[PDB]
Design a protein around this ligand. Structure first.
Ligand SMILES: CC(=O)N[C@H]1[C@@H](OP(=O)(O)OP(=O)(O)OC[C@H]2O[C@@H](n3ccc(=O)[nH]c3=O)[C@H](O)[C@@H]2O)O[C@H](CO)[C@@H](O)[C@@H]1O
Ligand SMILES: *[C@H](C)[C@H](O)P(=O)(O)O
Length: 419
């Protein structure tokens, strides 16, 4: 298993060009299963989840090719059962189900994998497809969906906010007979991006970005070209990298309006932030951040995908800060690893009480998920000495070229094979 060896401390400063969103590219690639004509999806990041997705689509009979763009021809899709080996390596695999049943009348997918930060059920996806008329049965380790003829539009009220289920329902609804109204829909920027990609193929969707999405089903979707929006979590990660290291960083190919809460929280921490149409700069002026209070919640509130990174920020900040995680139940394992690097924190139910220290110390650390792993690498950049972060393949799932980007910002980093 590869590891990153980091020698700190190093100020992280300069510029970085943000890649397309991991979490918009994924639902768009699965939505392309609905397309009868060639599709070109632009600005797709080179991530392990994207590679897994391309392999999964190919196994269903999709013809896929990629470079910066990914080309999809789903005209000959003819196998409606997704293989367990690909399905279980990430979360996005659940999105194959709705498109398959909506377009072909049937689809089978195993329970997904992905960030091991909670039980992460898919009951809401099941709920929504059933509301659209699909029969759902759990057999042989598969979630099997089927319908005789078209799905039927429905007024669907979500009992809980779910990014994934909102995408599943909105996507399947595009080929349903009639109108679907999703109430209490997730508002994430990736949902807006997926909706607009669907519309480019001929779908009729309005309300994306709000809590109510209305879809008017059509007979079929064609093809088209669509550019994936910038990755707000990769952006937030590098803004935090500047903030915790006293540097100034300018993020290019950014979309400022997807980060209102994160930018506001960084300003509370003392950051001097400026934004333009497609860029964001952050200058800490060499100053230590001020501790802040953070509570994760559905977009547009502070994102759980920036939680581990802000935990690191508070742990090197001046004063006592708070991190409250309301979305996932097992997303604090980066904490004991940072404590081994010298941090001071107490976990109390779904909250971490942070007591910032001036400097962290290098150590052999490991996280079992994407954002926590990236956070340990940032901690290594600012700690004194050598930090070795094990199992960094987790980072490959969500960051394109994090090694080259961090090195361009000043990091002393090396990828090693290790034992
Ligand atoms: C591939 C992708 O886009 N991943 C993102 C997506 O995941 P994901 O789509 O899984 O996020 P969800 O919004 O669906 O989950 C939010 C909450 O709802 C629960 N839930 C979800 C679905 C369901 O059927 N039942 C249920 O109980 C969850 O386990 C969690 O406690 O949004 C998360 C929250 O912003 C991000 O942190 C993930 O990086
Ligand atoms: C970590 C939560 C990743 O984004 P997912 O793909 O598993 O959701």
């Amino acid at each position: 298993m590869d590891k990153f060896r980091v020698q700190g401390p190093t100020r992280l400063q300069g510029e970085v060009t943000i890649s397309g969103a991991k979490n918009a590219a994924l639902p768009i690639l699965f939505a392309a299963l609905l397309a009868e004509e060639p599709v070109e999806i632009q600005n797709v990041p080179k991530l392990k989840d994207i590679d897994t997705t391309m392999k999964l689509l190919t196994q269903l009979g999709t013809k896929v090719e990629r470079x910066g763009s990914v080309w999809i021809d789903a005209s000959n899709v003819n196998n409606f059962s997704a293989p367990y080996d690909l399905v279980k390596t990430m979360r996005a695999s659940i999105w194959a189900l709705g498109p398959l049943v909506a377009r072909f009348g049937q689809g089978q997918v195993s329970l997904p994998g992905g960030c091991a930060i909670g039980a992460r059920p898919v009951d809401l996806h099941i709920f929504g497809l059933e509301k659209l008329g699909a029969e759902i049965k759990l057999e042989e380790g598969y979630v099997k969906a089927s319908v005789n003829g078209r799905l039927k539009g429905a007024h669907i009220v979500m009992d809980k906010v779910s990014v994934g289920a909102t995408v599943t329902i909105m996507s399947a609804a595009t080929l349903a007979e009639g109108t679907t109204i999703i109430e209490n829909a997730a508002r994430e920027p990736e949902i807006v991006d997926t909706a607009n990609f669907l519309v480019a193929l001929g779908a009729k969707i309005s309300g994306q970005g709000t809590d109510r999405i209305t879809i008017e089903g059509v007979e079929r979707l064609g093809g088209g070209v669509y550019r994936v929006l910038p990755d707000r979590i990769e952006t937030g990660t590098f803004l935090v990298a500047a903030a915790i290291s006293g540097g100034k960083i300018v993020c290019r190919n950014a979309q400022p309006d997807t980060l209102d809460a994160v930018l506001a929280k960084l300003r509370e921490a003392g950051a001097d932030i400026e934004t333009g149409e497609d860029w964001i700069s952050l200058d800490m002026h060499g100053k230590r951040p001020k501790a802040v209070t953070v509570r994760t919640a559905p977009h547009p509130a502070f994102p759980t995908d920036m939680q581990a990174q802000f935990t690191l920020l508070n742990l090197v900040a001046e004063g006592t800060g708070v991190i409250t995680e309301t979305i996932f139940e097992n997303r604090f394992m980066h904490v004991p690893e940072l404590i081994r690097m010298g941090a001071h924190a107490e976990i109390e139910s779904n909250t971490v009480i942070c007591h910032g220290v001036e400097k962290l110390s290098g150590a052999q650390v490991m996280a079992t998920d994407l954002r926590a792993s990236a956070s340990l690498v940032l901690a290594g950049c600012i700690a004194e000495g050598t930090t070795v972060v094990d199992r960094i393949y987790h980072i490959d799932r969500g960051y394109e070229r994090i090694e080259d980007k961090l090195r361009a910002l000043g990091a002393n980093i090396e990828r090693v094979k290790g034992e």
